[PDB]
Structure 1
Amino acid sequence: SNPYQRGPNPTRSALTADGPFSVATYTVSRLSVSGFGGGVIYYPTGTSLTFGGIAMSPGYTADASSLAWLGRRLASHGFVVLVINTNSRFDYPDSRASQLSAALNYLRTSSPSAVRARLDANRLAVAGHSMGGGGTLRIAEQNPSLKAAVPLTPWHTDKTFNTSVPVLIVGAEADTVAPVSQHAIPFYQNLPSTTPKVYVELDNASHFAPNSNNAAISVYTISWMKLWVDNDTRYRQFLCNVNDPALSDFRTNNRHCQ
């Protein structure tokens, strides 16, 4: 009944490993783009289907390589994913937001033929780490056409984002870079009450949790992207009636769980 549905009926276990699509990569050179620092596109092979696109930003001091595992993980479950480098590693969240926007325009207009053939540019979403997660929250305000946003251990001095884009924030309980009491939790709390929102807090986790393979980050990020980018309600089960021992906290307004 759902033309955007892809891949197997999900199990939680399967969402902790790479999915059913082999992944190709394309290097976007820094010089070839004005609007971000280039990056890497991860995209499905062995298929004639089309898939939603995701732009992902790294955080302060960080390169695209710091999220390579997660770009590959997402693409392997059926997405076209551009992980950027920023123009400067010292760019702040709102700059990263604008670079995510440039990245999405590039993906739609300028990517190689093999990538374009796999991309349904109607269906786009964003994610990012730390200051990149701050950028994800800002671009969600700016662009209500986005299907979803996943800020990962996000950092921003602005605590209130007026967005109608469905947001799932991952906090890291023990984060010392973007402490959850000052960043993730206020971001959650202050999103509109009418916007689908989830907060998942990783038990005893550090700021660096998103920079290596992480089961809970994989489960929730895939699930949120699937639910909203693909309308894939097979993933509601991981996002509703949640009692997850990997988490120190879970919050939602349960709009997606009627």
Structure 2
Amino acid sequence: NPYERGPDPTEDSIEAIRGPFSVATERVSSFASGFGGGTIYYPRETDEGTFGAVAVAPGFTASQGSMSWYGERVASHGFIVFTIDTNTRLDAPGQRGRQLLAALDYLVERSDRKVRERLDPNRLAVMGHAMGGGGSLEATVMRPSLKASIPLTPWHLDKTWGQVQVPTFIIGAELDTIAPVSTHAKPFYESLPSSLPKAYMELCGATHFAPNIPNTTIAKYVISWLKRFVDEDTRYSQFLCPNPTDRAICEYRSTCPY
């Protein structure tokens, strides 16, 4: 696999706050086309090859600051991470989906040469919290060539997602009362195609805002999902299949094996 980066993983390595790569940043003006700008986190070391990229959207009435801890943590494992701001704080999930795509197109077409030279434009992914998680679902319908999708405590009014063909990892929060898992996260997961590589992880005692602070349970499996599907890195299947049994997880579902 020409896309494998970093040494062979252990459960300690995927739980490490800092991965094998050092990270630099690049700020993007809000006058970028089609989204509200943001911050690009990228691995500095270039001798292992180019990397895939993930655009990360915040929730309703939130900014990239609520998602900033994903920047260095995920990028240090070998990824370009773009925490974006939206055009307005009130943008809906469909709008956030379009803006995740515009952020990715920015990386491919308009980003700084330091980012462009490190990017593989064929291996892109989306992630989002709350309404941004609904935008992550929307973006996969809008661009089926995406490699992975991670809706974090997602909010969306539409409960059926049977046309998604992008591998999708939904994280729910047990005590979420803003986007309850019974009416958002779980219906979304169950409506994804039964043949799709997918998973649902519910966090014990977590609130709707659990994704907004550093969480090792979230981070270790976000890293494993992006490795498995953006990098085609089967070295990380061991952490995804069979279903994780971490104490912080109160329910896990998957279409393992993959």
Q: For the superposition of Structure 1 and Structure 2, which TM-score range results when normalised by the shorter chain?
A: over 0.9
Listed one character per residue, the Cα deviations across residues 66-122 of structure 1 (whole Å, up to 9, x for unaligned) are: 111112211110011111100111101000000011111101000000001110011
What code does the residue aligned with 1:30 have? S
Please give the residue correspondences for 1:79-90 in structure 2 after superposition, counting only pairs within 5 Å. Answer: 79-90=79-90
What TM-score do the two structures reach when normalised by structure 2?
Answer: 0.96
Alignment of 1:80-159 (within 5 A): 80-159=80-159
Runs of 5+ consecutive residues of structure 2 not aligned to the other structure: none
The alpha-carbon deviation at position 143 of structure 1 amounts to 1.0
Matched with 1:168 is 169
Once the two structures are TM-superposed, the CA of residue 244 in structure 1 deviates from its matched residue by 2.3
Structure-1 residue corresponding to 2:9: 10
- Alpha-carbon offset, residue 159 of structure 1: 0.9
What residue is the counterpart of 2:242 in the other structure? Answer: 241
* Residue in structure 2 matched with residue 211 of structure 1 by the alignment: 212
CA drift at 1:255: 4.4
Distance 1:238 1:229 in 2: 16
What SS does the aligned partner of 1:231 have? coil
User: Per-residue CA shift, 1:4-31, capped at 9, x if unaligned?
Assistant: 0001211222222220111111110102
Q: Give me the whole-angstrom Cα distance separating, in 2, the residues matched to 1:51 and 1:137.
A: 23
1:173-252 correspondence to structure 2 within 5 Å: 173-242=174-243, 243-252=245-254
Letter of the 2:137 counterpart: L
**What is the rounded CA distance, in whole Å, between the counterparts of 1:196 and 1:46 in structure 2?**
31
* 1:211 positional shift: 0.8
Who is 1:75 aligned against?
A: 75
Higher mean displacement: 13-22 or 82-91: 13-22
Distance 2:223 2:98 in 1: 24
Task: Provide the rounded CA distance (Å) in 2 between the counterparts of 1:46 and 1:138.
Answer: 33
The amino acid of 1:104's aligned partner reads: L
Q: CA deviation at 1:172?
A: 0.8
Q: Is the 8 A contact 2:242 2:257 kept in 1?
A: no
Partner-residue secondary structure (3-state), 1:30:
coil
Kindly provide the amino acid, as one letter, of the partner of residue 113 in structure 1.
R
Q: 3-state DSSP class of the match of 1:125? A: strand
Tell me by how many angstroms 1:222 deviates.
Answer: 0.4
Q: Counterparts of 2:175 and 2:235 in 1: how far apart (Å)?
A: 32
Please, what is the CA RMSD of the aligned residues? 0.9
Return 5+ residue gaps in structure 1 as ranges: none
Report which stretch shifted further, 124-133 or 236-245: 236-245
TM-score, normalising length from structure 1? 0.96
SS at structure 1 position matched to 2:56: strand
Rounded to whole Å, the distance in 1 between the matches of 2:18 and 2:93 is: 29
SS at match of 2:117: helix
| Structure 1 position 183, deviation (Å) | 0.5
Partner of 1:46: 45
